[PDB]
Amino acid sequence: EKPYMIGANSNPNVINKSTTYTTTTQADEQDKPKYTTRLEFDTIDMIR
């Protein structure tokens, strides 16, 4: 009903942000994938 307006910003200020270090752990994980094109040799043509 009411018009949709941007309004004001909400992000607060942050100071002295420290880096993230990957934590060592013996526990298992799952490796986040990327699905995309694969490159391969033309082994048949290599035989030729």
Partner 1 sequence: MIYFVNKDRIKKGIPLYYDVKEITYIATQDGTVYEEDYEIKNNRLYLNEKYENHTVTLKILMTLRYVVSDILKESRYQYTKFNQPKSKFENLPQKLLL
Partner 2 sequence: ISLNPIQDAKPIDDIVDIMTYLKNGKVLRVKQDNQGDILVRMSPGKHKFTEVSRDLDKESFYYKRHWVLYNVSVNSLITFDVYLDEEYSETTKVKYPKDTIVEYTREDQEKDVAMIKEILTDNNGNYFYALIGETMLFDENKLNKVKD
Partner 3 sequence: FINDRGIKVLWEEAYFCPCLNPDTGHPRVDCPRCHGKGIAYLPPKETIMAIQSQEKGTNQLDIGILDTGTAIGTTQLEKRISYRDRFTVPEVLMPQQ
Chain residues that interact with partner 2, rule: CB under 8 A: 22-23, 25-32
Among partner 1, partner 3, partner 2, none, residue 18 binds (CB under 5-8 Å by kind):
partner 1
Q: Is 38 in the site for partner 1 (CB under 8 A)?
A: no
Q: How far is the CB of 29 from partner 3 (least distance, A)?
A: 18
Q: Is 17 in the site for partner 3 (CB under 8 A)?
A: no
Tokens of 43: 């082994």
Number of residues in the chain: 48
**d(C-alpha 19, C-alpha 24), whole Å:** 16
